[PDB]
Design a protein that fits this description.
heterotetramer; A: mainly alpha; Globin-like; 72% helix; globular; C: Globin-like; 7 helices; 0% strand; binds protoporphyrin IX containing FE; glycoprotein (chains A, B); heme binding (chains A, B); hemoglobin alpha binding (chains A, B)
Amino acid sequence: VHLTPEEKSAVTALWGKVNVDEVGGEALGRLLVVYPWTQRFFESFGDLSTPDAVMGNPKVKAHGKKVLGAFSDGLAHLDNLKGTFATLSELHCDKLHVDPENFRLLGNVLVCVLAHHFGKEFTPPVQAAYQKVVAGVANALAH
Amino acid sequence: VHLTPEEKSAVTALWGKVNVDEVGGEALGRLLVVYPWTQRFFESFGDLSTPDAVMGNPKVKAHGKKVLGAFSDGLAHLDNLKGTFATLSELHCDKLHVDPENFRLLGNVLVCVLAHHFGKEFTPPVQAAYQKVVAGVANALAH
Amino acid sequence: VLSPADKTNVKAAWGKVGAHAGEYGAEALERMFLSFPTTKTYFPHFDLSHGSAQVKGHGKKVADALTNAVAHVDDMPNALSALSDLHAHKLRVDPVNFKLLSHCLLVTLAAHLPAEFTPAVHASLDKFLASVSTVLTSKY
Amino acid sequence: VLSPADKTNVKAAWGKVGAHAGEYGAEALERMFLSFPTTKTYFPHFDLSHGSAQVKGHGKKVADALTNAVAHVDDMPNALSALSDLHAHKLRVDPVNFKLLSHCLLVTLAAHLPAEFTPAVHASLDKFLASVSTVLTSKY
Ligand code: HEM
Ligand code: HEM
Ligand code: HEM
Ligand code: HEM
């Protein structure tokens, strides 16, 4: 992903204050709530009927922690996203059969979560930089 | 795009019988008719109101001939597709501002045109091989 | 939001399809399975080989669903309510797969009705299948 | 198709937005222009810089249309017919741009209403914006 030095500095600075446990679980739960067809993949997690049940699922929170850890790993290697997300791409394509559009949906949900968490600190330039990082992670995973 | 020898032979054999002038204009006109928002890029071609006027447009026919020539050039280089469509990708992304979904829409319209022109000879295996080639051309252009 | 002219076009095209609708539905499903293998994950108990009786029966069911949708084009949302609940609430099908099946149906129609597949009929059938995919995707 | 629960959620969220609708719409337009370059091409006669009065007025118009849609959720196709004709017939806007504008509106709402943006309200607003987009992308 090509980013300006200011864009990369802003992305790193915003990711500095991201709480790893809270941000990932909330993004995954909001994905499962807003796009209900995504629960097909996570049926093994457990009760996902109501939004309050989705947001209060320890398995969902733990998987969100894992997903956001992968996002952080991709952030630390922004110049080699395709090589960073190769094993995960194979896992999601060959074994899970997740459609590539769902990666873009999850990235957009994560951007909304970041905006909800940071408020006015999530300026439009920061949103643009994070949109590009999210698209790069999604294109790397869809490979 | 990775193809089996059987798929590559079938694709080449079916493309050897394609009439370049008719197939390209048909695909472009059907794109303009089915997806009318694509006429924003061709508003300089003249009259595009009626479908009968769209399919009877010499400028549309010539542009479809050029597009199918590019498709054939990509077909001859199925291992070098990103390199062949670098100049076209730059042209479509920087000066024309074409969304990548339109490339896949045009590829599907071309597949429908091939099925219409070849009838029973367009077997499901041939369709699958051509779908993969069309997806690779769209991905190469979207870069 | 279909026009009267496109409604007439769709009705005429499906009437020309006629009794071959079940075979066309089975061929469309076979094309979808062959060109988009991720769609096969919705049929883990099915035999998806060529000429399969299970795929033939499912294609017949899909074809009769499309036929009654054409016969009730004005009232699709309640003509396909049971199907919409099964597709969205029970099966949980991605709308991308609905787009793929609509494309494969269009390819089958093009291959089997060369004369009928004018650009106007193509656009009418494309938007009719888009409307059908809309009703099945919507969840209530 | 919306339900009474998410309809109430949408009405409450937009009422909490209140008099800041024009500011929110201008901010959403700026976010869309910055995040996506292709959307700007539709405004070649505009001044698309930060703090632009033209973008501010356009955001005011967009927010007024959204407020009308919120007040007229049950008759959206008949309430947004002029906008549908403008965007589809005359401007010829790609539906992907409608999706991007909906996303940027959601981001602005999340950034400005932390407490109001629960997951249920997020889903309700996503469905409402999707309904508006499909109304505006329909060709009569
Ligand atoms: C940018 C987007 C995504 C990233 C970075 C990501 C990352 C990950 C990671 C790190 C794992 C853990 C793998 C392991 O522990 O071995 C995983 C597994 C998984 N992912 Fe994703 N993921 C993304 C999108 C999605 C989406 C959108 C879905 C479904 C709609 C999905 C479905 C799954 C499933 C079902 C698993 C396995 C969980 C289990 O078996 O319990 N992923 N992904
Ligand atoms: C998907 C595969 C496509 C291929 C292989 C392709 C190929 C080409 C080629 C070879 C040219 C060169 C014409 C020239 O240099 O004068 C061209 C130009 C152009 N393309 Fe495409 N194209 C594709 C998709 C699209 C789509 C989907 C659109 C619009 C929705 C589009 C819009 C245009 C326009 C507006 C021009 C310039 C026409 C002119 O200046 O007269 N292209 N394309
Ligand atoms: C696009 C138009 C579609 C139509 C008209 C349609 C119609 C039908 C019909 C009539 C049935 C039989 C239900 C019953 O007899 O109770 C059915 C079942 C089913 N459909 Fe669809 N369908 C469509 C799209 C799809 C797509 C795109 C998929 C998957 C990619 C899908 C997956 C299924 C599955 C898994 C079943 C259950 C069959 C079984 O478990 O034996 N459908 N559909
Ligand atoms: C929920 C989505 C949208 C709403 C509620 C909306 C609403 C409006 C309104 C109220 C106007 C004023 C009409 C006029 O001043 O003549 C307008 C005009 C316009 N819209 Fe939208 N719009 C939406 C989406 C979009 C998108 C996504 C784009 C482009 C990416 C777009 C492009 C335009 C353009 C170019 C104009 C003409 C502005 C002018 O002539 O000064 N619209 N829209």
